[PDB]
Amino acid sequence: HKKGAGSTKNGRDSKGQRLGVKIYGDQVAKPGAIIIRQRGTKFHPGKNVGIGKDHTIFALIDGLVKFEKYGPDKKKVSVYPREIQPENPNSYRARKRENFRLQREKKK
Amino acid sequence: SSRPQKKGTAHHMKTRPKKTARWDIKRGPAVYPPLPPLPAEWTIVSS
Amino acid sequence: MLSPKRTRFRKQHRGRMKGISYRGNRICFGRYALQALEPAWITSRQIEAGRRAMTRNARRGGKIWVRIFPDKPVTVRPAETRMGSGKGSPEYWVAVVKPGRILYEISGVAENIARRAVAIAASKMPIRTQFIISG
RNA sequence: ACCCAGAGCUAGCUGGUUCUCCCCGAAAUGCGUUGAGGCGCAGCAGUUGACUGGACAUCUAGGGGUAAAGCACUGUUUCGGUGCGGGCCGCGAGAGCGGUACCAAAUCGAGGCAAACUCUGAAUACUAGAUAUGACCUAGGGGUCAAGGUCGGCCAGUGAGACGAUGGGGGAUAAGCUUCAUCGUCGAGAGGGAAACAGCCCGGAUCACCAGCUAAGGCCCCUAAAUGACCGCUCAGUGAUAAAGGAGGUAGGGGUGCAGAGACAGCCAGGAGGUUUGCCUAGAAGCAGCCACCCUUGAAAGAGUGCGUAAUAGCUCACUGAUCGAGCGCUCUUGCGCCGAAGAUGAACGGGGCUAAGCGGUCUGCCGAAGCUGUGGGAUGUAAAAAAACAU
RNA sequence: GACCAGGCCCGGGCGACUGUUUACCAAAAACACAGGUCUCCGCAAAGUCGUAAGACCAUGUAUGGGGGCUGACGCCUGCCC
RNA sequence: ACGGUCCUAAGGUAGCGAAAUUCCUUGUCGGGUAAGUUCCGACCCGCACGAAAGGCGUAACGAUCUGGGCACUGUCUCGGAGAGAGGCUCGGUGAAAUAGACAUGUCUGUGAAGAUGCGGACUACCUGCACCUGGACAGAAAGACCCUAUGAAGCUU
RNA sequence: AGGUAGACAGUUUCUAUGGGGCGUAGGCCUCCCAAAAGGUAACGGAGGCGUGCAAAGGUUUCCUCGGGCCGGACGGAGAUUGGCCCUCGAGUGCAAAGGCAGAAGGGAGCUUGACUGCAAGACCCACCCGUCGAGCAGGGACGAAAGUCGGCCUUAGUGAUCCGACGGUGCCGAGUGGAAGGGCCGUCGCUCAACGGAUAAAAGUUACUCUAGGGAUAACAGGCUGAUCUUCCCCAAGAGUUCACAUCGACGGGAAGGUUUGGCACCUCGAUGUCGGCUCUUCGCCACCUGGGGCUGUAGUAUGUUCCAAGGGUUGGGCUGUUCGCCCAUUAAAGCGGUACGUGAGCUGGGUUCAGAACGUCGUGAGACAGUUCGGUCCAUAUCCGGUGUGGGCGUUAGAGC
RNA sequence: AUUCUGGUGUCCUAGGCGUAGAGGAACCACACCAAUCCAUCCCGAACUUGGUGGUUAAACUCUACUGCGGUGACGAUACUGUAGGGGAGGUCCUGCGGAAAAAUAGCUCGACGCCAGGAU
């Protein structure tokens, strides 16, 4: 009734190395910000963009990230600064942060 | 046999009382005409 | 015993049997066919035993075809043994059949006899099958 | 050995740790550990400073390879057609070769499968940016409140989790089994429904009222409320408890075969000569197994669906006349029932009991919680103090 | 004639035998035993106990003294350094 | 019995052998009994006897183990009767372990999965004394098994 | 001063674990599980690493592989040489995944950036650690130049701290000058592999044992589960002279039961006594006999099969601790189960869990072995419920005896 | 301002092949020779140098067809966010919201920018 249990020859792994897209498409970046840790060139380097020893793709300039279409079934990544970025005190966020600030000041 | 049976909260899952009949699920409270305005309760005028 | 020939990997998962079988609905060879309704894990012993019993009632002529081939393995662990300590060896191979799938096809006998035959072949199997004529 | 002393030895171990009210309120996870029932740091509490704006809601943009689907790749696979190459036999026995009851590469056509396959590719989720004024005052002014994070100081517990839903793994797609992922409840949560019943359903207990409305669930009596209504269904005590299979039980629907030039079921009728038929000559003779599955005589008959024989003989059923005189025969589909259904102190739907007081569908009343409403009282916080609210 | 006062036989295992032993669960097949063998020791002996002095051995000296194993008696006791 | 070949320091001689050794196993054969998993003798497939941790025999001896017979009987078939010492009743003296509180039924259901206490039924005047032990997971000893503690202590190389 | 006795002493002798032990594993990299961000467990499924290269690096220029088909000496399915056709299925030092076209793949020329001084900024996270890096400074490489180079197509090839060691260096140097000794920069010394490393240095046994704890954790019992067991049923190939269905029923399918052997670890470790026997029960039916039936391949007798039925009954011995089993003599028959494998505050103690002793075996040894043998202390005055008996009170409506 | 040929991109298979035709006035390519510059792991095949006497055949450029290749709906269906329900048999059903892949209709034989040179 009490038979022996056979050992395995498995049970080894490496904890997920945390690759993938760090800075997404149409998003803020920096000079030096790592955009993608990819194991090979899944995405390819575009304009304004360095490519490192590990095929790590990082931005050289400010601006928003762009994942372009390369030609025959591949992907690029370029970075573009943005011209004018308007802010209106009309809006809800602007209204509410000024309301909050004014409450803070009013209390103390 | 090989029909494992319902026990613990698994009994309570199965045999809970529940309506599950479209007409009985609707219904809700009964509607009425609200009411004309009523007077105070205990007006004073004294001492 | 319709066993697969040297597959990729030894042991594999159970998954489950959601959905209706869409593809193996059509009939190719036969004019009459046995079709499944409930999903099950059909061993090769059940297939072979259905095929034999269906063949026995062909008699004078008319050809029979099988349209389900097991592929998936199943392991029972070493009998009377505690939990854990790896998987077991695969005992037998099974066909994952879903609802509305062809199991056996047959052509070239009188509709009298085919229907009689598939009753036996239904009786050998673990599921509520049904008879279907189309081709 | 005992006695005294070091000595209140140490004990990550067990037990125990005493008055009251108010405010907030966890965790049972990750990481490391001579560590696994301990400890450290993170995560999640309290408290007190600093920095700002989010939160919930809707709408865009991003990269995904999962469910799905597919066979172009990687494997796997069945059948057919083309068929290199292989199996076996035949020759004037060392040059030479031809047959071939035959297994079959590779492509083509049809047809499947795949956690570790993808020419494809959802929903959610994740990241980012956008837009919207939550409750109380005469479309704003000025008001009152509630409403989320980041950083840091001081100072905790936790680090045994459990069940349920889903996605999976292990197991025997056994376990009130085990292990992860996302969420609910318990844990730390009273009350009502579930007979009793942590974990299911409803709902979050500041306190008082011999007021009211309702949620979940119910309205024959035990025991609050309809022995309410109208239309269907069951005949089983089903209504409490399980399958393969069995079936002129009963009710409805559609489709399908004949039928007062008369069907169906009963009822005396007919149901033939070569057929000892060729066949392995022991016999298969309408009926072991073979094929052929004749055509005549005809109101009709198959060289035969079954019984009966060593084989014949013989008995039927197919069909057709005749008697007879009105709706009947064979499938499909459901709805609700029956059998299948057998255990050990004694009945077990909660009990009585019920032909509805059960099931299905619809319509309206009512009951029903510590939920909400009303009427009063307390304490917090919004500042400091009182009144005044708003929230708690 | 009361009290008092052997039951006997046949076959096997283990140990020869009387003996000793777990006070308060074990009395035996366990220990001891006569007998056997090996090895040490020449006397200021080996051995033992002591820091030492010295004590036992022994007021004995190889037919004696210490230690290992076996266990009357009979027949035996092989191969391997 | 007879040979071939490998390894090893060497491959068990005499004797004994299913035994205080024997797993398979109640080995098989014969004896003993109406019937014998124990017993006696033989076989040898000695899992894993063996020559001074001696081998094999042996008259005697044993509160030794283990089989069989005769005699004997309440050991038993299968109980029965009687005598004492208690038990029982009366008077005198007078403990104990135990004890959350106890107004302390049966059935089935429920629940930390085995209920006098929770649900439904059933049964049941209140209270002594004699007898009986099924339950109170009855009492007794912070399990002596099992595992844990970077516990303790003996003993070994 | 060197050797040399567990004779004697102090210690050490890991953790995980679907109870422990026996095994297996312990660090790092790739894939899956993983649920289309990342992350993610199991004694889940699959493999690798503990390097290699002076060029397989750097740069400058040049090249397009692999597999088939057809022709061609030896030469064939395949070496070399030409043409054709899909074109990236090849290769990429080494496992996998992601990548790589005139390429990151293959060849050649020249060389050493496999360099010093750094570094805005991000990723990854408990900490320790790890990773990418625009650009500047110097001094070079290669090219005509623009430019590219601080190792490798990328992800494994690795260990902290203390300490010591070698090369560099007025930085200190205990009165002051030196020196001894430190510091500073560059570097070397771990299968510290139990790989976040307790020490420079450590194994066993206890049935002679003890303490602190645990139902967080096994053995007995219950519970869940029902794989195995027990009992039924569907199918029907076939056996039965003929005929599946008198009697059996292959290949297969579906159930119940909770008596076996398991799985789980939910109550109980501040104790619920483990087998068998005696005594005394009771209950279930899946019926051994006794009552009453259908079918029979039922002439009768005697059966076989199966339906109803659980009222009653279901011997005495030999052997074994045994339940079980075999055998002798019987008999209407010698049923099978539940009740903590009924019943130890009712009994027994033969078996099994203490200390002694022995045999075989394993162990260098102490000791060990569901291997064997002989010997080995079984408590209790009944509070309550419950039972068998038997009184007393009261009740029963005025009180009594029959 | 428009259209060609030669160079450069955006845009990458609605843009690629096949089939059929057409272009040498220019531009572009094939044929002549090679002391030398320079070269062949051999060879002026290629690189390079010097010349021109042929040609639109190959390539390249341009116009057509859908034969392939490619792209590809609507509708449904699978699947799934969320709120419920049925089954003990292991999955199914409903409301509310999102919505494939495949298949087919059909769509495609490029578009568009700048510069150099030629022509109207």
- The structure was resolved experimentally with cryo-EM
State the Rg of chain C over Cα: 17
Chains that touch C (3 or more CB pairs under 8 A): A
Among residues C101, C93, C109, the alpha carbon closest in space to that of C56 is found at: C109
Residues of A in contact with C10 (CB under 8 A): none
Contact C86 A3 (CB under 8 A): no
Helix (H, G, I), strand (E, B) or coil at A12: coil
Please report, as a single letter, which amino acid is at residue A99.
N
Burial class (CB in 10 A: 0-12, 13-18, 19+), B30: exposed
CATH code where residue C100 lies: 3.90.1170.10
Query: Among positive and negative, which fits the CA dihedral B18, B23, B24, B29?
Result: positive
What is d(CA A92, CA A96) in angstroms, rounded to the nearest whole number?
6
Nearest DNA or RNA nucleotide to B11 (CA to C1'): D200
> Which member of C79, C80, C85 has the closest CB to residue A6?
C85
What is d(CA C112, CA C109) in angstroms, rounded to the nearest whole number?
8
β-bridge pairing A43-45 and A75-80: parallel
**Element spanning C115, H or E:** helix C111-124
What is d(CA A8, CA A11) in angstroms, rounded to the nearest whole number?
8
What is d(CA C88, CA C76) in angstroms, rounded to the nearest whole number?
6
Query: Does any domain span residue C28?
Result: yes
Among residues A28, A30, A24, the alpha carbon closest in space to that of A67 is found at: A24
Q: Which domain holds residue C112?
A: 22-135
Sheet strands (E) in chain C: 32-36, 40-43, 63-66, 72-75, 90-97, 102-107, 129-133
Length of chain A: 108
Helix (H, G, I), strand (E, B) or coil at A54: coil
Residue B12 makes CB contacts below 8 A (sequence gap 6+) with none
Asked whether residue B16's C-beta has any atom of DNA/RNA strand F within 7 A, the reply is no
Residue A69 makes CB contacts below 8 A (sequence gap 6+) with A75, A76
What is d(CA C47, CA A81) in angstroms, rounded to the nearest whole number?
67
Q: Does residue A10 sit at the C interface (CB-CB below 8 Å)?
A: yes
Contact A7 C82 (CB under 8 A): no
Residues of C in contact with A6 (CB under 8 A): 78, 85-86
Give the resolution in Å.
3.6
CA C83 to C1' H4, in angstroms, rounded, equals 84
What is d(CA A63, CA A46) in angstroms, rounded to the nearest whole number?
14
Query: Does any domain span residue C10?
Result: no
What is d(CA C28, CA B22) in angstroms, rounded to the nearest whole number?
46
The 3 state secondary structure assigned to chain B is CCCCCCCCHHHHHHCCCCCCCHHHHCCCCCCCCCCCCCCCCCCCCCC
Partners of A57 in beta bridges: A36, A51
* Sequence ranges of the domains in chain B: 1-47
Sheet strands (E) in C19-89: 32-36, 40-43, 63-66, 72-75
What is d(CA C57, CA C94) in angstroms, rounded to the nearest whole number?
25
Query: Does any domain span residue C100?
Result: yes
Query: Does any domain span residue C15?
Result: no
What is d(CA A10, CA B43) in angstroms, rounded to the nearest whole number?
88
Contact A8 C85 (CB under 8 A): yes
> Which member of A3, A4, A6 has the closest CB to residue C86?
A6
Chains that touch A (3 or more CB pairs under 8 A): C
What is d(CA A31, CA A84) in angstroms, rounded to the nearest whole number?
19
Among residues C102, C130, C126, C131, the alpha carbon closest in space to that of C114 is found at: C131
What is d(CA B1, CA B16) in angstroms, rounded to the nearest whole number?
26
| Structural domains counted in chain C | 1
Residues of A in contact with C86 (CB under 8 A): 5-8, 10
Residues of A in contact with C78 (CB under 8 A): 3, 5-6
Count Cβ atoms below 10 Å from residue B45 Cβ, excluding itself.
4
- Alpha helix (H) ranges present in A2-108? 92-107
Query: Does any domain span residue C14?
Result: no
Query: Does any domain span residue C4?
Result: no
Sheet strands (E) in A1-108: 20-21, 34-37, 43-45, 49-51, 57-59, 64-66, 75-80
